[PDB]
């Protein structure tokens, strides 16, 4: 047999496949085969026929497709152009299925930042130059809705940078009603916010400057308003603005999420800039004045005494069939996140689930069923299991449908449902070979294996993989979870060097049962190193005390947990105490820099890639959610005492590598610039590397270059 090579990892050689059906009905779904033909699939009859041929797509170089619910018009998307992590612009054509030619008479402007159908019928809503346009049919001129849209100043229907990256994680801010009656959009105002300007070089004689509205910690925030308009007669009274609750409307506040319940009912969630209070409001529609009213008896408050509300984001409620009560997961009395059922007041919440374990996410709620994720199985906090609960039945019930289907192979599941929950799909990511299956939906009996990955298994018969285990440490009433990767033919009578991979970000988890063939596998399989990941306090999915122990104090407990784990590993017996290294990425860079300069002498070399130097250089939302205001009255003391530049004198007897991208928009180059300047002023030697015109992800050949350089550094360190 042979071991893994670096070229197997740099270029895609062992990469699995996933099958996510593009559900259009409760019994049918579309797919794109390996022929550029868009094919419809029905389950009851089983017949599949091509609904869009490859010649039509090749005519316009179409790369994406979108089908109207009435199945009379399709839109083809080409000229893809990425903007941020989630946003992009593309050119759209419209093709008529009944007649067989492209619709003519009124073309769409290009480029378009976002486009969408309506749930019922075929009427189009799109965004062109920060304004929202509505078309009743693809053969009629558009009806403009908004006029104040301006580049980088006013945004309509799409979020700005902060909400796209920190709040919504989406590229859209417009919502259609369930029956396609109204349209709810959001106006973002960024006029007083300071801008960040960096240089982009490109293939030109003069480099240009990119300016982005970016609120740092303690700066001015965007101003958001929410409008709801009617689509049938959109000029009778015009857009109407939903009232803001008085309790929220006393200082700066954020907009969390919007969700439609019925045709005359909306739900909006609000957060104060002090992020330990959240408010849920339900707004109803009055026909006598064509208005939206948000009463006070329909106000729900959620406050966290020991920390921020929720985790990384705020839980989005799921509404029942009667549209009068809902479900939401939050912390219980003992400090464990669980499901609660709200009907009238937040004081009458009902604990449907209770236990030491946690609930991660909720997928579907129906008239007599409810689906969610949990770690309850065998006290392993790295496994995702999908469960099923019964609602409104004479006997109570609860069943785990993904527990013993494939035990030694699959312990990680993601569910994708259809209309009326008649059918759904399960995707398994690890720890065995990833699989994709489709289930009945009522008896939950497997029907058709959508993806098995036989080619990967056949190709992995002559490669010996490193062995992976997950175990637990108990130190000073603190439970740490560590995953260890060991080379093949491992004996405990010898000594091997050790590498630690750390992220440690708040509300995160790096110890999960997932399948991946990556750089770590190459290092363990060929170079004979032992790799480890450790999770301690400050991470998620284990409890409330563990999660909130890091509140208002970032950069203290993670380093202690890493050092404790390293010392226990050395005490285990098979680790060379003269060869230990650590590395991380974008929060693991911060932790790696703090741990390398802790003065304990445990580590020999360290690598930091795109780290955060100071917490005053990052976005307001994320920074202030876990730290607080940088004012002399609240938390200015810890801001100045938790910077990497304050440890510059402790890098003198270690090896350090610093890597960052020039055109990064998420973590700016100024962090690495300040780190380098601090190390220069302290007369400390280090190594550096930059990548020109590269974003946070370092896509392309930059990834190959980065991994080769890091491999050389690690080989020289442990020689």
């Amino acid at each position, epitope marked *: 047999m042979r071991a893994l090579t670096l070229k197997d990892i740099l270029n895609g050689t062992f990469s699995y496949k996933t099958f996510f059906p593009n559900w259009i009905s409760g019994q049918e779904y579309l797919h794109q085969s390996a022929d550029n033909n868009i094919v419809l699939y029905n389950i009851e009859t089983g017949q599949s026929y091509t609904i869009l041929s490859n010649r039509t797509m090749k005519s316009v170089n179409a790369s994406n497709y979108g089908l109207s619910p009435d199945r009379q018009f399709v839109y083809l998307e080409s000229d893809y152009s990425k903007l941020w992590r989630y946003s992009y612009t593309a050119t759209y054509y419209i093709y008529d299925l009944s007649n067989g030619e492209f619709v003519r008479g009124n073309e769409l402007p290009r480029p378009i930042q976002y486009l969408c159908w309506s749930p019922v019928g075929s009427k189009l809503a799109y965004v062109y130059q920060n304004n929202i346009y509505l078309k009743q049919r693809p053969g009629d001129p558009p009806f403009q809705i908004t006029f104040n849209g301006r580049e980088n100043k006013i945004f309509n229907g799409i979020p700005d940078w902060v909400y796209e990256e920190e709040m919504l994680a989406t590229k859209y801010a417009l919502w259609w009603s369930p029956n396609g009656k109204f349209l709810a959009y959001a106006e973002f105002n960024d006029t007083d916010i300071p801008v960040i300007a960096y240089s982009y070089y490109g293939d030109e004689q003069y480099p240009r400057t990119i300016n982005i509205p970016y609120p740092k910690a303690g700066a001015k925030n965007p101003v958001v308003r929410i409008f709801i308009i009617d689509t049938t*007669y*959109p*000029a*009778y*009274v015009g857009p109407q603005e939903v009232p803001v609750p008085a309790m929220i409307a006393s200082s700066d506040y954020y907009f969390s999420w919007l969700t439609w319940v019925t045709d005359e009912r909306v739900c909006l969630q609000w957060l104060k800039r002090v992020q330990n209070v959240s408010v849920l409001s339900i707004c109803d529609f009055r*026909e*006598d004045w064509q208005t939206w009213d948000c009463p006070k008896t329909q106000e729900h408050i959620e406050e966290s005494r020991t920390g921020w509300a929720g985790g990384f984001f705020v839980s989005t409620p799921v509404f029942s069939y009667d549209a009068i009560s809902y479900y939401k997961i939050f912390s219980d009395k003992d400090g464990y996140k669980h499901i609660h059922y709200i009907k009238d007041t937040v004081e009458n919440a009902i604990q449907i689930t209770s236990g030491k374990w946690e609930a991660i996410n909720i997928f579907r709620v129906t008239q007599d069923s409810l689906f969610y994720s949990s770690n309850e199985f065998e006290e392993y906090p790295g496994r995702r299991n999908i469960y099923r609960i019964s609602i409104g039945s004479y006997p109570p019930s609860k069943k785990c449908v993904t527990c013993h289907l494939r035990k030694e192979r699959c312990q990680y599941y993601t569910a994708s449902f259809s209309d009326y929950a008649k059918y759904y799909a399960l995707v398994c990511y690890g720890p065995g070979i990833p699989i994709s299956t489709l289930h009945d939906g009522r008896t939950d009996q497997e029907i058709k294996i959508l993806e098995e990955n036989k080619e990967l298994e056949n190709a992995l018969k002559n490669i010996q993989l490193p062995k992976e285990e997950i175990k637990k440490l108990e130190v000073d009433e603190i439970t740490l979870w560590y995953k260890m990767i060991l080379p093949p033919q491992f004996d405990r009578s010898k000594k091997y060097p050790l590498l630690i991979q750390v992220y440690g970000g708040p509300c995160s988890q790096s110890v999960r049962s997932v399948f991946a063939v990556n750089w770590i596998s190459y290092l363990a399989s060929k170079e004979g190193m032992v790799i480890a990941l450790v999770d301690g306090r400050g991470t998620a999915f284990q409890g409330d005390k563990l999660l909130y122990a890091v509140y208002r104090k970032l950069g203290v407990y993670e380093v202690e947990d890493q050092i404790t784990a390293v010392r226990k590993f050395i005490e285990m017996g098979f680790i060379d105490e003269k060869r230990i290294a650590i590395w991380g990425w974008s929060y693991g860079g911060y932790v790696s820099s703090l741990a390398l300069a802790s003065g304990t002498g445990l580590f020999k070399c360290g690598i930091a890639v795109a780290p955060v130097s100071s917490w005053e250089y990052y976005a307001s939302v994320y920074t202030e959610r876990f730290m607080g205001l940088p004012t002399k009255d609240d938390n200015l003391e810890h801001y100045k005492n938790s910077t990497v530049m304050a440890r510059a004198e402790y890098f003198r007897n270690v090896d350090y590598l610093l890597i960052h991208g020039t055109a990064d928009d998420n973590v700016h180059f100024q962090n690495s610039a300040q780190i380098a300047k601090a190390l220069v002023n302290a007369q400390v030697d280090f190594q550096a590397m930059w990548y020109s015109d590269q974003n946070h992800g370092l896509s392309g050949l930059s990834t190959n270059h980065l991994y080769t350089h890091m491999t050389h550094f690690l080989k020289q360190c442990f020689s």
Partner: nanobody
Amino acid sequence: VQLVESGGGLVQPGGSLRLSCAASGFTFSSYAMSWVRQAPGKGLEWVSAINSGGGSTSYADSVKGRFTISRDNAKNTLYLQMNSLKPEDTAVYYCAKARTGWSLAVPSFGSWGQGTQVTVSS
């Protein structure tokens, strides 16, 4: 139900006019009333509203402080007085009857008549 409107016509800029509307069939003096307009090629745009009792009246943001409304239940008539005209009000006007007499209410798409054309130009 029958509604018939009259008045208006061609007018020079800076002028002033008044239009009248009369309805039959249903029971008057018990429902609120409103005035709507339809520009050529555009959609219906609500202009003003008046209470059943005649006390409180509401005017749109485009006709604020220039338009006045009145009603007389004795003769069952509605008057709209449009002063300080500008070359953007060329449209056909209609009177609309609401379905709520307990208070003011803007009718959405209830009873309709024929409408009266008004054009302002130099």
